[PDB]
Amino acid sequence: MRARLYAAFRQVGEDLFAQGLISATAGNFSVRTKGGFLITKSGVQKARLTPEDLLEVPLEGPIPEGASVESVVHREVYRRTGARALVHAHPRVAVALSFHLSRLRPLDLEGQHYLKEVPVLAPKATEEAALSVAEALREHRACLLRGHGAFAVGLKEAPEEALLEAYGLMTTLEESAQILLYHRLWQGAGP
Amino acid sequence: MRARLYAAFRQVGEDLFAQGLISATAGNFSVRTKGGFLITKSGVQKARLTPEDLLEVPLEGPIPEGASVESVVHREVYRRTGARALVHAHPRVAVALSFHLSRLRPLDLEGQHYLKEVPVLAPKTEEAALSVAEALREHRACLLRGHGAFAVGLKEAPEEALLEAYGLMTTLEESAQILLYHRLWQGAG
Amino acid sequence: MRARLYAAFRQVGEDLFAQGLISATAGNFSVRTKGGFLITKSGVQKARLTPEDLLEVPLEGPIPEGASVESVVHREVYRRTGARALVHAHPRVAVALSFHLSRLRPLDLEGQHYLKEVPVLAPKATEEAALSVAEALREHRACLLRGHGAFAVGLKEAPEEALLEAYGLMTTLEESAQILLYHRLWQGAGP
Amino acid sequence: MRARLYAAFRQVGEDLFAQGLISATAGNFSVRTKGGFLITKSGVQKARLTPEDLLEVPLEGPIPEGASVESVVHREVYRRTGARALVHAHPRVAVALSFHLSRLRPLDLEGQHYLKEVPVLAPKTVTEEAALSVAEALREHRACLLRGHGAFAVGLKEAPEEALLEAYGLMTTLEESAQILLYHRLWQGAG
Numbered sequence A, C: 001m002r003a004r005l006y007a008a009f010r011q012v013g014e015d016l017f018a019q020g021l022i023s024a025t026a027g028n029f030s031v032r033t034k035g036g037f038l039i040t041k042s043g044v045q046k047a048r049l050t051p052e053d054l055l056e057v058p059l060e061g062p063i064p065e066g067a068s069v070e071s072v073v074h075r076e077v078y079r080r081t082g083a084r085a086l087v088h089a090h091p092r093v094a095v096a097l098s099f100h101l102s103r104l105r106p107l108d109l110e111g112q113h114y115l116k117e118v119p120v121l122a123p124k125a126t127e128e129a130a131l132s133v134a135e136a137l138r139e140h141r142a143c144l145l146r147g148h149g150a151f152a153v154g155l156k157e158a159p160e161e162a163l164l165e166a167y168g169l170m171t172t173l174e175e176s177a178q179i180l181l182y183h184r185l186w187q188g189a190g191p
Numbered sequence B: 001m002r003a004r005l006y007a008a009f010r011q012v013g014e015d016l017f018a019q020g021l022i023s024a025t026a027g028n029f030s031v032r033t034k035g036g037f038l039i040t041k042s043g044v045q046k047a048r049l050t051p052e053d054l055l056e057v058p059l060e061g062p063i064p065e066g067a068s069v070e071s072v073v074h075r076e077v078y079r080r081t082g083a084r085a086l087v088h089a090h091p092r093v094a095v096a097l098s099f100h101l102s103r104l105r106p107l108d109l110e111g112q113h114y115l116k117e118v119p120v121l122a123p124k125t126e127e128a129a130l131s132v133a134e135a136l137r138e139h140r141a142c143l144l145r146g147h148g149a150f151a152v153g154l155k156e157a158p159e160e161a162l163l164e165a166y167g168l169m170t171t172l173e174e175s176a177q178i179l180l181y182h183r184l185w186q187g188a189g
Numbered sequence D: 001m002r003a004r005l006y007a008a009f010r011q012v013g014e015d016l017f018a019q020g021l022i023s024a025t026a027g028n029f030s031v032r033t034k035g036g037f038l039i040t041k042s043g044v045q046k047a048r049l050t051p052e053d054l055l056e057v058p059l060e061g062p063i064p065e066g067a068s069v070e071s072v073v074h075r076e077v078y079r080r081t082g083a084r085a086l087v088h089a090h091p092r093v094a095v096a097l098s099f100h101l102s103r104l105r106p107l108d109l110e111g112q113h114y115l116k117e118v119p120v121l122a123p124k125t126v127t128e129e130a131a132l133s134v135a136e137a138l139r140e141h142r143a144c145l146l147r148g149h150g151a152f153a154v155g156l157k158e159a160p161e162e163a164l165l166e167a168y169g170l171m172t173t174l175e176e177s178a179q180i181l182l183y184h185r186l187w188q189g190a191g
Helices: A002-018 A071-080 A092-097 A109-114 A127-136 A159-187 B004-018 B071-079 B092-098 B109-114 B126-138 B158-185 C002-018 C071-080 C092-098 C127-139 C159-189 D002-018 D071-079 D092-096 D109-114 D128-140 D160-188
Strands: A028-032 A037-040 A054-057 A085-089 A118-121 A142-145 A150-154 B028-032 B037-040 B054-056 B085-089 B118-121 B141-144 B148-153 C028-032 C037-040 C054-057 C085-089 C118-121 C142-145 C150-154 D028-032 D037-040 D054-057 D085-089 D118-121 D143-146 D151-155
Touching: A002 A028, A002 A037, A002 A085, A002 A159, A028 A071, A028 A159, A037 A071, A054 A071, A071 A085, A071 A127, A071 A150, A085 A159, A092 A159, A092 D160, A109 A159, A118 A127, A127 A142, A142 A159, A150 A159, A159 B092, A159 B158, A159 D160, B004 B028, B004 B037, B004 B085, B004 B158, B028 B071, B028 B158, B037 B071, B071 B085, B071 B126, B085 B158, B092 B141, B092 B148, B092 B158, B109 B158, B118 B126, B126 B141, B126 B148, B141 B158, B148 B158, B158 C092, B158 C159, C002 C028, C002 C037, C002 C085, C002 C159, C028 C071, C028 C159, C037 C071, C054 C071, C071 C085, C071 C127, C071 C150, C085 C159, C092 C142, C092 C159, C118 C127, C127 C142, C127 C150, C142 C159, C150 C159, C159 D092, C159 D160, D002 D028, D002 D037, D002 D085, D002 D160, D028 D071, D028 D160, D037 D071, D054 D071, D071 D085, D071 D128, D071 D151, D085 D160, D092 D160, D109 D160, D118 D128, D128 D143, D128 D151, D143 D160, D151 D160
Parallel strands: A118 A142, B118 B141, C118 C142, D118 D143
Antiparallel strands: A028 A037, A028 A085, A037 A054, A085 A150, A142 A150, B028 B037, B028 B085, B037 B054, B085 B148, B141 B148, C028 C037, C028 C085, C037 C054, C085 C150, C142 C150, D028 D037, D028 D085, D037 D054, D085 D151, D143 D151
16 A cells, blocks of 8 residues: 555655654664565664555564664564554653653643553663563553663554554643643742 | 635744744644634644644634644634734743742843733643633733643734744743753752 | 845744744834834734835834834834844743743853843833833843833844844844753752 | 865854854854865855855965954964864854863763863963964864864864764763753752
C-alpha cells in the first residue's frame, strides 16, 4: 500500500524533527506487517525520508543490516504486544523529569485521557531493555526509558493511522511533561 | 470566501503547532457564520489542515459528526455572546498556572491591554459550555483549569477575527511565561 | 532613497514578529530624516508593512494623524539625541526581569559590548516616559521601561543601517535577559 | 558546488536564528575549502544570508577584510585540527551553565553519544591565545564552550555542506543537553 503508508512515515519524520522530539538522525518508528514490522533505517535524515529509507524486519530470526539498532526493541514489542505501530523519541522535558520519577502522571486533561500513566524504566540497545519496554507497553501507551527517551505505541488497524496515533501520543507526552515542569517551578519556588 | 478563510484556518493550525500551543491533534478553532459557526474536524493534524478538515454546525441542534467534541462549547459561546471567532488551545505555561490561580492578570502592557484579566474556570459538558460562554463576554480569554484556554475573536471579516483570537492566544501564553519567569527570578536569587 | 529604506522596515517588522519580540500590531520603530523621523503607523500588522504604513513626523509641533501614539517618545529621543533609528519592542524575558531591577547587566560578552548596561526607567508612553527614555538613551544604547517594553537606539549614518542596528540590539538584549534568567535559576536552585 | 553549499549556510543561519541560538548577527560558521575556508561575512543578518555574504580565507596570510571578526579562530581550528566545518553560536542555557562549570557533561543518551564531554574554556588574562585554546580544545572534542561567548561545534563529513549541517546539528544537541541539565536541576530543587 506504499503510497499512503509512506505519507505517514515522511510526515511523522518531518514532524518529530520540527518539534525537537528527535535530532537529524535519531529515534525510530515502525508499523506492524504480515511478515514482521516496517522500520526506518539507522543513521539517516528522518525528516527527508524517502521509500528506500524504510526496511521490513521479521519477528523471525535474522535482523538484516541497515535496520535501526533499536530494532531488537520494536520486535520484542511486536512479539509481546498487540501494538500496530511504535515511535521512539526524545522529548527533552519528559526526559529531564524521567530522572526523578518511576511513574509520570500527567496533570492535564488531554494527558490523563490518552497517557493515563507513563512508566519510567531504570536500566541500571539490549535484549533486556527490550523486555522491559515490551512489558510496559502491554497495558500502557507510552513509557520513558530513563535518559534514553520515550516509546509510544499505536493500536489502530490501519498501519499508517497507527503511526500517527503513536507520534501523536509522543507529542501529548512532551506537552504533559512541560505542563508538569512549569506547574512545579511555580508551586515550588516563589510566593 | 473559501480563499482567505481557509488560508487563515491553515495558518492558525501550522502556527499553533509550531508555537507549541497544541499537540498534533489537540485543540480546535471556529468562526461565526450565517448558519452558526465553521470548525475544525475532530481527529486530524492541525498543522496539515485542509478545506475538508472543517464543516458548519448550525446553532440549532444538528451537530454533524466529525465536528469537534467541543463544538458544544463553541456553539454556546456563539449563542449568548457577540463572538465571531474562537480559538481553543493549550498554552503550556498558562495551563500550568491555572491549577493555582483563580484569575490570570498579566503584569505586562500588551497583556494588560487585551487580556485585562483571564479568569480560570473549574467545571466538569453543558456545564462547561456555559461557564465559558459567560466569561467570554466581559473577558476575551478564559482558562479551563487543566484543560486549556479559549480566546475570543471580534473582527467583522471571519479570517481576521480568527487570527485576532489566535493573536490573543500567543499573548495569553507570553503573559503566563512572564508571570512565571517573574516569579522564578525574584523568588530564588 | 525609499527602496532600501523600505526593505529595512519590512524586514525589521518581519523578524521582530518571528523572534517573538512584538505581537502582530504592537511595537514601533523609526529612522531619522531631514524632516523629522519616519515611524511606523498606529495599529498596523508590522510583519506586513507597506510603504504606506510608514509616516513622516517633523520634530516640530503637529504630529500627523495616523502616527504611532508614541511618536512623542521617538521624537523626544531624536530631539535630545544623536540616535538615527529607534526600535521599540516587547522582549518577554527582558520585561519579566525589569520588574525587580533598576539596571540590567549582561553577563555575556556580546551583551557587555553594546548593551554594556541596561537601565530601567519606572513609570511613577507619556511625555514623562519619553523625556525619561530620551535622556536614558543618551548614555546607553537601550533601555527597559518596567512593565512596558524596551528601547534600542541605532547610530549608523545610513538610516537603513541604524534601524537594522537597533533591531539587532533588541535581539541582543533578549539573548542576555535569557542568559541572566537561566544563569540565576541555576546557580540559585542548585547546591 | 556553490549551489548546495549555499543551501547549507542559508539554512543554518535561518535555523540558528529561529532556534534561538544566535542574535540577528552574532555567531559565525564555515566549511574548510581547497585554499582555506569559506565563512560568513561580518555584520550581516545571519537569518537572511545571500551568496555575497561569504568570503574565502587562506590558512596563511592577509585575512580579507569584511570577513568574520573571529575568522582567526576558525583559521586556527582548520590548521590544527581535522575540522571540515565549524559553527560558532550562542546557546543560551548552555552559556548560563558555563559560567561556573569547567566541563559540561550531558545527562541524556543522545548528548553523551556525540558530545561525550564539552570543555568550558574560561580565560583570565595572562586573541590568538584564545584562538589557540579553542583549537586545542576542538582537537579531542567536537564541541567546546567559551565562557560568556557561546560554543563551537565541529563537522567531520567529507562533503562540506554535510559537515556544516552536521555541526549545526551538534549545536542543537548541545543546547538540548544543557536544557535537560537545567530542568533536571530545577525540577529537583522542588518537592
